[PDB]
């Protein structure tokens, strides 16, 4: 099969909750379950048709055995469904979609689901096994420990971004200008109904139906903030992604599978892949994966109508756009992780699902998402 | 490409350590690093040639950001290497190999490594985020919580095995006879040098060069033990797999990649896949995945020379053999997880690597490994 | 020396804070320090004159080394001051005063301070030393563990009170009537300025100057509440004492010491002592200690103008009054622990200090306070 | 009464166990129970005659409600018995005896028990109440937190001793010579049967009948050790007291009570008291309390036949002896806390009970014990 036989037939996501707020105490598996129910409904695919699932999640500690399996069975899929979880840090939700696409192209399955999820609010603290040391010991926070602290450099992802920003003269002022644009774009998109196709609401009693993060902004305060990660840094709490909860899922099949069940293909796969570099330099990895997947698709930069370059920090889209010569009016046009937030296992799936829904038929979209350890995932789709 | 273009060029593993013993306080990332270095040496592949890695690991809590990445960089691979972790419970090490095979068949990479790892000794305890409730709360053990307790039935994997055993009249005595055979087969294999090709030793100061579990047996005591999981049960500490630490890796390429680099293919891929059923019934899933992968390879039961059916409990090989009509003299002939131990992320890779080394040229081997949540992975290879 | 040579020259207390409210995160040592500064100021005694201190505190875990010493040095006393802490559960603050009185009567010191303190809000959770058990373990709440759970019966103090209430036909209705009277008396006393002599305020920024608990009442809801401790119980959250934070201190000397420093004796000691019975029956112990200290003072029930019978539960003053034939109009006339709250190490000192301030000159007051394990302290003073 | 009317009629103690060794996991209340039963048996006093108890214990966290009460009821005393715990750090066991003596002299009771206890092995770790902070927090060790760290200087008691040693030229070599003498004196006393009168054994299954610490010595290694507390320090693990478990109790009455019950007085009280100085200087406090209690008894240094100056560190007896001009052949003649160990709540009672048994009729003994926060207790008795 050619890669273009792989089609997306549905996509949905939860709202993104703010840290310890809307989805406080809501396990990641609940979020994933509701996103998957939503995606299957969007696809008009009954859960019993799903043969296999790949779900990204980075720090599922204390969510119980096989949280990806919990999601799939919770969404009503049959126990015959095959399920795997993947962790590629913030690329997890995209890599899950890639793995699903690979088994479809090899005709190993016909109907598959994929996506990503994270509850950063529910990440626990750790105590090591064995003898508690005389004199006491640290209760370890799983978020920096397994999520956000670089092992090799022993500094947070944001401090890595400070390094890249200084090296490439990406100023505090440019980062704040970009952050403001992201917040304003997120608000405009919500007002225009842009997310209506892709959002499913949750009851928690309250009903959560809107992204929580993007109203949490004070434009006048942004240039006044102190550096958040290093003493002479440029990255701040306003121009960095936030800690968040959410899930995003897609339903994928082959052209034959769609015909067989009378489904409407929403988009098709053109290319996917990954690139990596030094851990501290994850911020430049999207600029390497993008040419790689363009080449796989037989396309050039001018052929992409919309870019989703995950806003890990304002630093990353800024580096990527300037280094590759991208038009900012075609990049992250409905906001991104700086203003919508960043449940790390979710975001890679969210930005792909967003392109599936928001591209006009015929248009091509490219998503690129950097990840801890120095990587980035890339993916190109064509709207149908 | 055809699946038969996918070839294994190397395989290696650490010894398996017993719980809180040989590899006590040794992070999973150290174990995986040494297994990966060993596999690359076995393949005569310089680490700089590795383009992508998939590594299985089930409960990596508190091992730091991106433990699979830590392994790959620790082993000397270039920062350009693409890395993903996978969790399919005890099938993780096998599913990783499958994912690697898929991208090789699609010509998305040429040189890939895959495997699995677990340090059960280093799994931590959890405390949830937020208010410790008045009256106190439970400090949670990550091993049952994220590893071994079934979410849906709220019983341990061994209690699930008790259920399957009683349903299908797999007696305590049959389970004990199988357990004794496994311990004896493990000791005989060690004495005969069977594992010399696949083992790499580790310095921990001690040198660990031998599987620690298989000498921890008293044959006369085995029929005297009480049930380990349920009051009227048949599963015991002796006829159940143990808790362990270890890692296993393989190096994979295409027939063209092997030619290009002057490498000797050891084995080729014939088929891989997965099946699943009700979570409590994971023990019967290997009996479903085996016919599935036989059909994918165009083979019958008689065409397989060696079976590796992971010994999660003696129950599982016994059910599988009697349901499919397998010859026990061709099943788990050098022992298995009851006597060698079961680092859950490792075992699916171990049993495939074992077939790569121990099959005679021209022979075909089938590996099947059940997993929490109701699944099993399957794989068939042919020795060259 | 006769006991009547022992005189009180000052007394002060903090407001009582509600659980995890006004004094949340304020260590017990801060509360004790401010109460002791206040008492010394009330006495017109410079801190350098204090020779010895006894301070009651029941659960000082994690308050650091020698919290009683911390209080004394924090209040400005010289390092030459001798300091001891005592724990007699809820009798601690009274027993501390008794011990101080004993060394004054023996002329072993001339100027001493005594009192009680507790921060129930700051009591920690416990994890035992050594190997954390496989499968997890309980994080133990210090409040029930070291404060409120009876060791012998393995039930809470309130469940003990249910037992005594049922045995002596002290009804739910009588307990609620008493609880209402306590809340109304507390409010009336605050409005009338009754506590103005004895209270010192604290800055925490906010200024805490009033008892927090006594406004936390809904009179209409009281008869509607469910039992709080046992399924068919009579004790409820409204008619039981609450969990609270506070400290109370007194300054004591001999008649000669007062003359020497030109101090005004506020009251003199007539008798003190203790009685005890079966742990579950602590509620009847005040009725035994009262005749004991009356006999020591050469007095009868009619000779006491005011009674302070600590309101551990409404059960306890009710039992005591009816069994001894006391006039309720002379008992706990300005409220008590049901409505003002009950920092367990404090209350014994509070009720004595209250009598020191609120008796008219010439009048005699008797304080009696039951305690976990089956005890009660008693004390009689004469206002001067 | 005169102080000389107060008589000791019995004394006993557990062996002292080494940290996490003989009495590992044995609650302090068990140790105190057995010591109290033993003392009552030594006195030939039936437990039902005991009217009141004072028991010292410094860090009873997680030992349950009212551990002193648990000891008294566990020993078979009547529920009518009045019970109080006291904490004066390492003076607790002595101050308890003082408090008992005071109420006997005032004729408030006739038959009283007193002593001290500690299980340092069972001291727990602490987690504060409320939100675990983002980023994690310290699991606190109760031993330094509530036992051994000075609050004001934020250094351990051993670091305070380093300060006193350097200020007064008490050399490493002098401290080591004293430590060696203590270990040798302890071994000689054990061999000579010195402790046979005062020890009661315990079943834990093992029988513990001997002090565990004094054989844990290597004389040749002592001068080779590194400082234990400060980089340029003189205090080492060998010349400092150790962490230990144990309990010691006495039975006390008046000359009239002894006559009434046909008991033999063993010793009489001559004086008791306390002194204090700056917290870091607790090591010089015994040199202040000794002249104080000598004056109270109308005695001089030459009138004392045996000194028990608690060996918190070798520093403390050395300072005391040279400052007061004491004859070392009369000081700690059967070893002390450096070689026998130092359960902090126990030791003040142990050294007084030891004098009760080991003094010859007509001899006078003085005990002095320093304590955290800057204090020392002192006591003088006369053997009958
Ligand atoms: C490797 C590939 C990747 O994807 S890396 C990305 C992974 N994710 C991350 O690294 C998450 C990084 N983010 C964080 O760690 C947190 O959000 C950080 C930066 C630490 C901020 O947390 P925290 O300090 O708790 O936030 P805060 O809300 O209290 O803000 C601090 C001060 O800044 C202000 N602030 C914040 N946002 C805005 C805004 N949009 N507009 C105006 N002001 C803002 C807050 O008001 C606050 O101010 P103040 O100090 O209280 O006065
Ligand atoms: C879903 C797909 C899957 O892969 S499921 C499988 C995943 N893994 C698991 O589920 C791990 C299951 N195993 C376990 O949980 C533990 O190994 C269990 C069964 C609990 C045993 O742990 P534990 O009780 O600590 O072991 P233990 O060594 O103290 O043994 C208990 C008593 O039995 C004995 N015993 C043990 N093994 C043998 C043997 N081979 N021969 C003779 N005797 C044996 C021990 O001597 C011990 O005896 P005793 O009670 O001390 O007298
Ligand atoms: C041995 C000698 C001694 O001194 S023994 C005494 C030592 N101290 C103790 O034993 C403390 C005993 N008290 C306690 O343990 C707690 O205060 C108990 C009883 C458990 C209550 O705690 P908690 O359940 O958290 O309180 P809550 O405020 O949520 O109340 C529960 C429901 O009752 C109500 N309530 C309470 N007080 C009143 C009142 N004064 N008037 C009207 N209603 C009241 C609350 O509104 C609450 O109602 P709801 O269930 O939320 O609808
Ligand atoms: C304020 C009034 C007071 O009463 S203050 C006193 C209160 N109590 C205290 O302060 C307790 C002070 N003691 C302690 O904290 C511990 O005992 C300290 C000093 C920290 C020692 O603990 P730890 O380091 O675990 O001991 P350790 O047995 O491992 O010994 C360390 C090395 O020294 C050696 N050592 C020890 N004792 C002896 C001896 N008697 N003869 C010869 N050698 C000795 C050990 O062999 C050990 O050597 P190595 O480093 O393993 O080679």
- CATH topology title of the largest domain in chain A: Peroxisomal Thiolase, Chain A, domain 1
The CATH class assignment of the largest domain in chain A is Alpha Beta
Helix content of chain A: 25-40%
Question: Quick one: overall form of chain A?
Answer: globular
Largest sheet descriptor of chain A:
10 strands, mixed
Order of helices and strands of chain A: EEHEHEHEEEHEEHHEEEHEHEHHHEE
Number of strands of chain A: 16
Approximately what portion of the residues of chain A adopt beta-strand conformation?
Answer: 15-25%
Architecture of the largest domain in chain A, according to CATH? 3-Layer(aba) Sandwich
Largest interface: A-B, 66 and 66 residues
Number of self-contained structural domains of chain A: 2
Q: What is the subunit organization of this protein?
A: homotetramer
Structural class of chain A: alpha+beta
C-alpha-based Rg of chain A, rounded = 20 Å
| CATH superfamily caption of the largest domain in chain A | Thiolase/Chalcone synthase
Name the bound molecules: propionyl Coenzyme A
Helix count of chain A, per DSSP? 11
Euclidean distance between termini CA atoms of chain A: 19 Å
Domain Thiolase C-terminal (chains A, B, C, D): 263-383
Organism (chains A, B, C, D): Ascaris suum
Active site (chains A, B, C, D): 90 (acyl-thioester intermediate), 342 (proton acceptor), 370 (proton acceptor)
Protein name (chains A, B, C, D): Acetyl-CoA acetyltransferase A
């Amino acid at each position: 099969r050619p890669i273009t036989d792989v089609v997306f037939v549905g996509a949905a996501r939860t709202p993104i909750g703010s840290f310890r707020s809307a989805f406080n105490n809501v396990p990641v598996t609940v979020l994933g379950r509701e996103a998957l129910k939503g995606a299957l409904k969007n696809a008009n695919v009954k859960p019993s048709l799903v043969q296999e699932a790949f779900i990204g999640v980075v720090v599922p500690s204390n969510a119980g055995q096989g949280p990806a399996r919990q999601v799939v069975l919770g969404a009503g899929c049959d126990v015959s469904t095959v399920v795997t979880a993947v962790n590629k840090m913030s690329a997890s939700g995209m890599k899950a979609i890639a793995c699903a696409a690979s088994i479809l192209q090899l005709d190993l399955q016909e109907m598959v689901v994929a996506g990503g999820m994270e509850s950063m609010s529910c990440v626990p603290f750790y105590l090591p096994r064995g003898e508690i040391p005389f004199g006491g010991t640290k209760l370890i926070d799983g978020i920096p420990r397994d999520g956000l602290n670089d092992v090799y450099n022993d500094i947070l992802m944001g401090a890595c971004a400070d390094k890249v920003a200084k090296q490439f003269a990406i100023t505090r002022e440019e980062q704040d200008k970009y952050a403001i644009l992201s917040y304003k774009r997120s608000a405009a998109a919500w007002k225009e109904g842009i997310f209506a196709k892709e959002i499913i609401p949750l009851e928690v009693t309250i009903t959560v139906e809107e992204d929580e993060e993007y109203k949490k902004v004070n434009f006048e305060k942004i240039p006044k903030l102190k550096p958040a990660f290093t003493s002479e840094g440029s990255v701040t709490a306003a121009n960095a992604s936030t800690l968040n909860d959410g899930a995003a899922m897609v339903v994928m099949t082959t052209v034959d599978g769609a015909k067989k069940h009378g489904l409407k293909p929403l988009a098709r796969m053109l290319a996917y892949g990954d690139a990596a570099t030094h851990p501290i330099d994850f911020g430049i990895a999207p600029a390497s994966v993008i040419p790689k997947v363009l080449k796989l698709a037989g396309l050039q930069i001018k052929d992409i109508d919309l870019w989703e370059i995950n806003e890990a920090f304002a630093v990353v889209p800024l580096y990527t756009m300037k280094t590759l010569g991208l038009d900012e009016s075609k990049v992250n046009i409905h906001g991104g992780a700086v203003s919508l937030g960043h449940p790390i296992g979710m975001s890679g799936a969210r930005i792909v699902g967003h392109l599936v829904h928001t591209l006009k038929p015929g248009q091509k979209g490219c998503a690129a998402i950097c990840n801890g350890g120095g990587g980035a995932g890339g993916m190109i789709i064509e709207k149908l």
